[PDB]
Design a protein around this ligand. Structure first.
Ligand SMILES: CCCCCCCCCO[C@@H]1O[C@H](CO)[C@@H](O)[C@H](O)[C@H]1O
Ligand SMILES: CCCCCCCCCO[C@@H]1O[C@H](CO)[C@@H](O)[C@H](O)[C@H]1O
Ligand code: NA
Ligand code: NA
Lengths: 430, 430
């Protein structure tokens, strides 16, 4: 506060302002004033991300857009649960100390000292993050990353943090795509368009395994150089096997309608029956307010719809768009890759935009998928400043940080991103 | 290997029932499931929350429901109202509104002891109606063991008699009386469609009789601040004003459909707008596994209704009860309040029994309410051995040698109530 406290107030004014004049049509007035109002709180963060989320539904309902239980049922949506057991799988894989060994194992696999070790770290960050979490994975990775440079002290110069520490934060964010879980933007794409685990994986996984080298290499030239729980490991693999091949498997049992969730809910089940994780540790590791957030953004979408806003937008958007894209259109949306670097919460960014862009592509009768993936894949591309995203913050503390060296470097990457994404987006468009 | 084996038995029992039960199919499933489930919730070999996730998963694999529609139960509007509760308390604790209400009421008795212990009971009950029990208990403990210091005596009771039981029990009696804390009361209102103000119509005057009674039978047998936490109290009061008056307010609006959920939800706003409590705190405070349990439990009441196991059981007991009750029923249903207690688990108990009793009572052409209320209130009547409830299990340090002492003192209490619930419940027959 009082900043945040007033901003809300400013935003209430903004709403009342739009709501009361903005003549248009009443139910579009609603959608817009609401759209804008929520557009603010989630950008910045004037309230907490999760609060505004819980704000969304009560604002439908009152205003009569929905009825309480229907507005609420948004939270029960299946991807949320897919995500929930994503968390569970991590939580277990942590508390049994599986990740600890992975790094200890792959790092030490580097044999001697430094040279290769650094890159090892990068991969293990990306691989590990694929599954666990960005910040979490970055945080955990950081202390091992300091250990690798000790006799590597180097008042001169860049290796200690610039590169390796900065590399890590970046790897942490890159393999954050590549899997529907996590980070949460992927989840929110998936919720919106109804992607399967492997559906999303088809896109991210490769985009990730290119953007990674591209990033580290860009990074390189602008700097440089100098135990019984296998059950967990196995339960992990089966759950992931079940996810990839979900299609034939589900096909082959009949049904099943959102298999990937049952596969996931199926993990927490086998994990807790196998006695390899306690629910306390699930409940802690689980970010309950992202799951809450998912539903917020789902409710938003249905608001944009019932209200008529999502169609109105596309109407007004029409003449303009028919002239430009899709190649200019996706260059341009992919240019909100620059936009997760300013106040982000890539989550809250994704939370805001995907509903808007997917549900307009719907009144144009194209697939909400392309934009919805891209927007989400772009939001994870946040580099160039702490913060967000937090892995940046994580690395920014301690040894020879930069603050303008992030700034420089993150610019050449963020661009080779906006380029690389536009590139791929175009290919899958064939 | 303990628990895991109990699980195997539970699976062995299921396969038995599934293959050998001689009725239709849907009933074979329904019964089969009501059994395996019940076995797992009573005991707890799975945890609980794990069990609750299981309800939906079976239900969709046996085709009873489709994935979402099953999952949609998790988002029922009462879970949110209970989340509401959790934040209201997340806040009043974070601020110290609990300690203050406690300290200032307690110390108010000036000269110590006699008035001061009874001071303690009223406070613990007040603090419970809103916050929690386990929470409210562990909080009262130190404050209790301090109040009794000057008498450290091996002579004798006055800790293990009036203090620690009178404390632990006051938590539980205050457990009732409001929809928020502990969960059974929610579970009931959840299934039979009760408002905050309805459930108090019963629960409150029930906990007011009951506290003195638990205190009487327990006798004859066995600095301060005030900071800006004042706003919290204002918010709290206001929330409780709308909750009480929800009825005439709502209709002076129209709708609104689950107004009390809105009211609760709005509380989460007012609180976090007033910069009085963070999400970090609401999240750490809330018991997500209960919220989760709430839903999966609901999924189960729905499994009964559908598979027609509800009328199976209803028709099954048709002769026994039609010539038996009602009186005998309620006396009997209540007297299963000796249940909890042994092997206990006050929540998980009510989580099995309400769906069951509620949905039969419907099958009989009877308002679900009265029974389901009774079952919850009863569910909180845990005295004699710990656990459950945990309040019991808390107060064991020091005069904890009580052991039998509880068992003894508690037996009268248990029965005392078997008469009391049966009285009120019959008078409520109007
Ligand atoms: C926490 C925020 C509380 C906001 C409550 C404001 C409610 C105002 C009602 O709007 C209504 O919308 C309808 C269309 O949907 C119109 O038909 C109707 O004429 C109009 O009255
Ligand atoms: C993680 C625990 C979940 C495991 C549950 C597996 C249940 C599969 C059985 O389905 C049932 O089989 C019958 C024939 O065999 C069919 O007639 C019927 O349609 C169908 O209801
Ligand atoms: Na991640
Ligand atoms: Na309580």
């Amino acid at each position: 506060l009082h900043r945040n406290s007033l901003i809300v107030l400013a935003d209430v004014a903004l709403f009342l302002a739009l709501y009361h004049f903005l003549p248009f049509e009443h139910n579009v007035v609603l959608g817009i004033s609401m759209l804008a109002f929520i557009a603010v709180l989630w950008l910045t963060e004037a309230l907490h991300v999760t609060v505004t989320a819980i704000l969304v539904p009560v604002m439908a309902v009152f205003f009569g857009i929905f009825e309480t239980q229907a507005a609420l049922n948004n939270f029960a949506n299946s991807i949320i649960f897919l995500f929930l057991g994503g968390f569970a799988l991590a939580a277990a894989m942590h508390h049994q100390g599986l990740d600890k060994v992975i790094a200890d194992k792959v790092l030490a696999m580097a044999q001697g000292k430094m040279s290769v070790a650094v890159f090892m770290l990068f991969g293990v960050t990306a691989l590990l993050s694929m599954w666990i979490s960005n910040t979490a994975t970055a945080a955990m990775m950081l202390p091992l990353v300091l250990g690798v440079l000790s006799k590597v002290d180097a008042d001169k110069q860049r290796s200690t943090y610039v590169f390796v520490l900065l590399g890590v934060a970046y790897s942490a964010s890159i393999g954050g795509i590549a899997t529907l879980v996590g980070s949460p933007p992927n989840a929110i794409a998936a919720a919106e368009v109804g992607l399967s685990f492997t559906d999303w994986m088809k896109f991210g996984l490769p985009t990730a395994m290119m953007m990674l080298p591209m990033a580290i290499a860009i990074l390189y030239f602008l700097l440089k150089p100098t135990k019984g729980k296998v059950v967990t490991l196995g339960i992990f693999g089966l759950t992931v096997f079940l996810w990839i091949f979900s299609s034939p498997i589900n096909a082959a049992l009949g049904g099943f309608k959102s298999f990937d969730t049952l596969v996931a809910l199926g993990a927490i089940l086998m994990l807790s029956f196998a006695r390899v994780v306690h629910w306390k540790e699930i409940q802690k590791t689980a970010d309950w307010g992202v799951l809450l957030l998912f539903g917020g953004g789902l409710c938003l979408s249905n608001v944009l719809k019932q209200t008529g806003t999502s169609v109105f937008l596309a109407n007004a958007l029409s003449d303009m768009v028919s002239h430009m894209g899709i190649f200019v259109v996706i260059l341009v949306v992919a240019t909100f890759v620059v936009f997760l670097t300013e106040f982000a919460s890539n989550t809250a960014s994704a939370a805001l935009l995907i509903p808007v862009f997917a549900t307009v592509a719907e009144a144009f009768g194209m697939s909400p998928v392309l934009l919805s993936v891209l927007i989400a894949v772009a939001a994870s591309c946040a580099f160039m400043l702490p913060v967000a995203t937090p892995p940046n913050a994580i690395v920014f503390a301690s040894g020879h940080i930069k603050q303008s060296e992030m700034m420089r470097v993150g610019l050449y990457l963020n661009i080779a991103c906006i380029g690389l994404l536009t590139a791929i987006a175009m290919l899958f468009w064939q």
